Write a structure and sequence with these properties.
This protein has 21 helices and 29 strands. Strand 21 and strand 22 form a beta hairpin. It is globular and about 105 Å long. It binds a molecule of 8 linked components (NAG-NAG-BMA-MAN-MAN-MAN-MAN-MAN), the ligand O=C(OCc1ccc(OC(F)(F)F)cc1)N1C[C@@H]2CN(C(=O)[C@@H]3CCc4[nH]nnc4C3)C[C@H]2C1, calcium ion, chloride ion (CL), sodium ion (2 copies) and zinc ion (ZN).
């Protein structure tokens, strides 16, 4: 109960919340039905509207008015935003030339430039260009400030997961808001867009910007705004707050608009009805900037204009129904729409089996517009598994489509023409970023980046130490005039061994065989040099990766490749090699088909053996450096060493062989040479982090050879492709992947066809950031370049999406 007998007089939009004194006056009391009786009268005044008029100029103060045009309004800080324009002959901010803001120009007593985050729901990246004619204030922020062509949201591309990612720098799986609708089995509680439960503190993990600020002595305005408070009032409140005394004034503020998302849902992303919402948003930005200009704060405040996600065309007729696939449809619960999450309707149902469900949903229709996954098999780049609120069974839905449980759910819930929530690499889901102010750069375009990076930057903008998060701090230094964060490269934890020839052939009883025993001082001194590392400068272009955890490993040198070989995991952690544009593909000779050779630098006890592979009817083996790309017939023997071998399912060998035999050479030709680092990944607990030895759930039968969950490759070349990969003077170009190591190709519906028809599509889906691979391997790449460390960090966060231009 709320005894709302108290008063909001002098308390409107109070920053500090109240419990004991019964009545509340903050922009959140509406959501609790706990506002003072006089809240509306005192705090939501509307009289005379939102703009000054010529006749209102100089008027006597009338406290009933929504905003003021009297002479005293400026010092009081409550003028209508157009006051100086209408009454004092000033120009609107949008009509002023832009001028570089080299330094904050703030009133006396401002300790730091304030930050205002202007966030817009459903603001698709392409609106910046397509709506540019009707959005002059936003176009000025964009062209005069720092802007990306687009910003990548997190999956799912829903409002709460994204806004809370912006606030925390965390993947949804870590912050816990993994959808707009959620069931937590530990609390036995449901989170819904509508209602009370979403306000419970237990849903919201990590440390959002406002708590980071408060704990470090920096005051914050409220982030959440009640839906019925009009945008003009939201603006005027922020402007009022900015006029508070030094000791009370917040340094960080948030505005939120329900538009253009609200209209996009009803009309689609480019419905003709979409022009007006874009116009209204721009008008709100104008009121803010005019308002700042009035307060002499328009060259003081840093302003971020940011979206949560974009918007796609989706209509009722484009719905797949699980009732068309399952006979058991009433035994499951589905979280429906632009993603699917399935669990058992009842945890008492012993007959429920996720395996039969997955099978019944796999490639059953010609043009199936969703694909089923166990969550740990979803593309690693989505970081969407490590939370008990994410159901084991997930459906990735094609863009433009919906999944539902049965037709009644869709016609007894066509209204909507737009939706969002799809895979975060989908172009229509891309959103916006503009930064404008003394701390951002002037007239600067930056490459697209992910929204997980912004928390760190907002901390930099406010002088805060960020809480631990999923951004890569420093990777956005190129957005900033000053306040850059300059990290040091992490220290290597394990130094490598450099073994020479220590074992005789006969010491190895591995059950391996090779027709290699066919016999010169010219080329024998030459091969010893290669084994000492004489070609290493060619195949290790960016220095060796640092191992950031305690382990035992060897560096192994060869003519065509170098590797860091793990004595603990009995395989390389990484294998590095350069393939030039002129390089040639050769076949595996007949006498070498099933050849595996003991490596005389590495003990039998730290080697794989062929007998385990023979015994394991499910498991076969592949090579990290591809024999097909050896530089000569003599060098090819190196690719058959037991230390270059890794466990592979025959189904995965089809993918891997096509990558190695076909695609590497294709990249080398397209990119003017490529450097490749490949290796295994072990993530059995699907937390996105390197497993320790005691977390491994599968070994090659009868052995201690651990089975990877994934294979990565990092493919680097010169950004200026007129320069060969191995002779590059400037910035680099990278694409990488994390392929799931699976015993079937059920993921690829076209897989009974030639690899040329399905493998590259699989790899595109499993595209990855170098940073994703770092977390997963405990390695740190690009240690020795001539490039700035921040530039390298940006490169490590790059994701090659394979979407056409936005
Ligand atoms: C993205 O960035 C984030 C942030 O950096 C990374 O997440 C971190 O990963 C760390 C490494 O795994 C993890 O560290 C653990 O912390 C445990 C204590 O955690 C609590 O306290 C912190 C600090 O305030 C808080 O942040 C946590 O909040 C989590 O949990 C609450 C629920 O209570 C959620 O509301 C919240 O959203 C968040 O959940 C997320 O993380 C947890 C895991 O912590 C997941 O379960 C959730 O699904 C969700 O993803 C907590 O309130 C601490 O107990 C751990 O220590 C164990 O393991 C170490 C290994 O070194 C071992 O030495 C210890 O002995 C201990 O083991 C003991 O417990 C085991 C399990 O109970 C048991 O099996 C053993 O036998 C032992 O008895 C560990 O140090 C850190 O918590 C999170 N932080 C966050 C915010 O998520 C993330 O890795 C990044 N992602 C990528 C891909 O890079
Ligand atoms: O005012 C706000 O957000 C400020 C902010 C800015 C930047 C942020 O990020 C950063 F901190 F980084 F700046 C975070 C928050 N919000 C965001 C909420 C999303 N929302 C909803 O989704 C409704 C839920 C109740 C409901 N019932 N039926 N339909 C709904 C939909 C209500 C909005 C009010
Ligand atoms: Ca792991
Ligand atoms: Cl959801
Ligand atoms: Na086998
Ligand atoms: Na298939
Ligand atoms: Zn929406």
């Amino acid at each position: 109960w709320t005894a709302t007998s108290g008063s909001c007089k002098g308390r409107c939009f109070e920053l500090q919340e109240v419990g004991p004194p019964d009545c509340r006056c903050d922009n959140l009391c509406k959501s609790y039905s706990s506002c003072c009786h006089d809240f509306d009268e005192l705090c939501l005044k509307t009289a005379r509207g939102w703009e000054c008029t010529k006749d209102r100029c100089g008027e006597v103060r009338n406290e009933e008015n929504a905003c003021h045009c009297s002479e005293d309004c400026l010092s009081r800080g409550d003028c209508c935003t157009n006051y100086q324009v209408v009454c004092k002959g000033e120009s609107h901010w949008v009509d002023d030339d832009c001028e570089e803001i080299k330094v904050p120009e703030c009133p006396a007593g401002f300790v730091r430039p304030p930050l205002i985050i202007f966030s817009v729901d459903g603001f698709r990246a392409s609106y910046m260009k397509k709506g540019s004619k009707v959005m002059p204030n936003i176009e000025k922020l964009r062209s005069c400030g720092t802007h990306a062509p687009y910003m990548r949201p997190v999956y799912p591309t829903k409002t709460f997961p994204n806004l809370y990612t912006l606030a925390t720098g965390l993947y949804p799986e870590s912050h816990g808001i993994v959808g707009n609708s959620m069931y937590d089995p530990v609390f036995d509680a449901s989170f819904h867009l509508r209602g009370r439960e979403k306000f419970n503190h237990r849903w919201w993990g990590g440390q959002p910007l406002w708590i980071t600020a408060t704990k470090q002595g920096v005051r914050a305005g409220t982030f959440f705004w009640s839906v019925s408070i009009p945008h003009e009032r939201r603006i005027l409140t922020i402007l009022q707050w900015l006029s508070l005394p030094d000791n009370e004034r917040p340094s960080v503020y948030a505005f939120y608009s329900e538009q253009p998302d609200f209209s996009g849902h009803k009309y689609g992303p480019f419905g003709p009805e979409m022009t007006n919402p874009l116009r209204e948003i721009d008008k709100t930005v104008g009121q803010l900037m005019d308002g700042l200009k009035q307060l002499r704060l328009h060259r003081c405040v840093n302003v971020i204009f940011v979206g949560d996600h974009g918007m796609e065309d989706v209509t009722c007729d484009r719905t797949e129904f699980l009732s068309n696939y399952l006979t058991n449809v009433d035994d499951i619960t589905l979280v429906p729409g632009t993603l699917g999450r399935i669990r058992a309707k009842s945890i008492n149902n012993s007959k429920y089996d996720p395996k039969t469900i997955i099978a019944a949903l796999t490639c059953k229709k010609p043009d199936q517009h969703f694909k089923p996954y166990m969550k740990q098999h979803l593309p690693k780049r989505l970081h969407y598994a490590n939370n008990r609120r994410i159901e084991d069974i997930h459906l990735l839905v094609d863009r433009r489509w919906h999944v539902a449980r049965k037709p009644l759910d869709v016609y007894k819930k066509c209204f909507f023409q737009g939706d969002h929530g799809f895979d975060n690499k989908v172009n229509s889901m891309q959103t916006v970023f503009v930064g404008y102010g003394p701390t951002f750069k002037y007239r600067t375009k930056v490459p697209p980046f992910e929204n997980i990076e912004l928390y760190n930057v907002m901390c930099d903008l406010l002088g805060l130490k960020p809480a631990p998060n999923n951004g890569t701090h420093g990777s956005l230094n190129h957005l900033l005039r000053t306040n850059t964060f300059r990290p040091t490269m992490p220290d290597e934890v394990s130094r490598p061994n450099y073994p020479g020839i220590m074992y005789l052939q006969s010491e190895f009883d591995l059950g391996c065989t090779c027709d290699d025993k066919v016999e010169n001082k010219l080329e024998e001194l030459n091969k010893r040099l290669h084994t000492k590392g004489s070609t290493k400068e060619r195949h290790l272009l960016y220095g060796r990766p640092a191992v950031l955890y305690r382990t035992s490993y060897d560096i192994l040198y060869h003519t065509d490749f170098e590797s860091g070989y793990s004595e603990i995991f009995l395989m390389p952690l990484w294998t590095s090699y350069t393939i030039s544009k002129q390089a040639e593909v050769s076949s595996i000779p007949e006498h070498l088909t099933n050849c595996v050779r003991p490596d005389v630098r590495v003990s039998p006890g730290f080697s794989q053996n062929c007998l385990a592979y023979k015994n394991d009817k499910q498991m076969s083996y592949g090579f990290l450096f591809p024999p097909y790309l050896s530089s000569s017939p003599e060098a090819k023997y190196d690719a058959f060493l037991v230390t270059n071998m890794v466990p592979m399912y025959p189904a995965f060998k089809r993918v891997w062989a096509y990558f190695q035999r076909v695609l590497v050479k294709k990249y080398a030709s397209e990119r003017n040479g490529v450097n490749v680092i490949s290796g295994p990944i072990f993530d059995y607990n699907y937390d996105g982090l390197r497993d320790t030895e005691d977390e491994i759930k599968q070994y090659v039968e009868g052995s201690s050879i651990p089975v990877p969950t994934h294979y990565y490759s990092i493919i680097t070349s010169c950004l200026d492709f007129t320069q060969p990969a191995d002779k590059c003077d400037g910035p680099l170009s990278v694409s990488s992947f994390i392929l799931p190591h699976r015993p079937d190709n059920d993921e690829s519906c076209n897989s009974s066809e030639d690899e040329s028809k399905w493998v590259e599509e699989l790899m595109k889906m499993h595209t990855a950031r170098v940073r994703d691979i770092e977390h997963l391997t405990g390695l740190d790449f690009y240690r020795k370049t001539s490039r700035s460390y921040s530039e390298i960090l940006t490169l490590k966060t790059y994701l090659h999406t394979y979407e056409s231009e936005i």
